[PDB]
Amino acid sequence: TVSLWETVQKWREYRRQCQRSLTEDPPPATDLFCNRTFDEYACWPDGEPGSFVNVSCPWYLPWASSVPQGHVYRFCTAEGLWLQKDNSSLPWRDLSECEES
Amino acid sequence: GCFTSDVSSYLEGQAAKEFIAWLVKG
Q1: Can you give the residue range of the structural domain that contains B19?
Q2: What is the CATH architecture of A4-98?
Q3: What's the domain count of chain B?
Q4: For B5-11, which contacts have Cβ atoms below 8 Å and span 24 or more sequence positions?
Q5: Which cysteines does the record link by disulfide bonds (chain A)?
Q6: Cβ neighbours of B26 in A, within 8 Å
Q7: C-alpha span between A99 and B16 (Å, rounded)
Q8: How far apart (Å, rounded) are the C-alpha atoms in residues A58 and A66?
């Protein structure tokens, strides 16, 4: 029932609101924080070293109303680097709580 | 899930889902 065009429009607005935050949000307490970023799926804020960072499931998802308590996660290492998957230069991410159904 | 409109609706719903899968993996 949810169309591609409606989802694309919602995603563009999510990206725009995210870009506003990336530019406007105050600087991190220290350089040891992992840097905020938009990874095409979710908008990530700066991360405290050695901690998990969570954001709600992206609101543009067609099934967003079905995962309102969900969160997507990343891990900011003690050295201030987003944990990376051994597979590549991509960050480890846990999106399981935002999957359909 | 037995009528032509069930398949058509399913097909239409897949475009949005493929878009998401593309954002996730890419």
Answers
A1: 1-26
A2: Irregular (4.10)
A3: 1
A4: B9/A1
A5: 18-43, 34-76, 57-98
A6: 40
A7: 14
A8: 12
Rounded to whole angstroms, the Cα distance separating A36 from A19 reads 10
Residues of A in contact with B23 (CB under 8 A): 11, 40-41
In DSSP terms, which residues pair with A47 in a beta bridge? A34
Nearest CA-CA distance, residue A1 and chain B, Å: 6
Q: Which of residues 18-37 of A touch B (CB under 8 A)?
A: none
Dihedral-angle region of residue A40 (phi above 0 means left; psi in -120 to 50 means alpha; beta otherwise): left
Method by which this entry was solved: X-ray
Among chain A residues, the shortest Cα distance to B15 is held by: A4
| Tokens coding A64 | 């967003």
Q: Which residue of chain A is at minimal alpha-carbon distance from B6?
A: A1
Domains in chain A: boundaries: 4-98
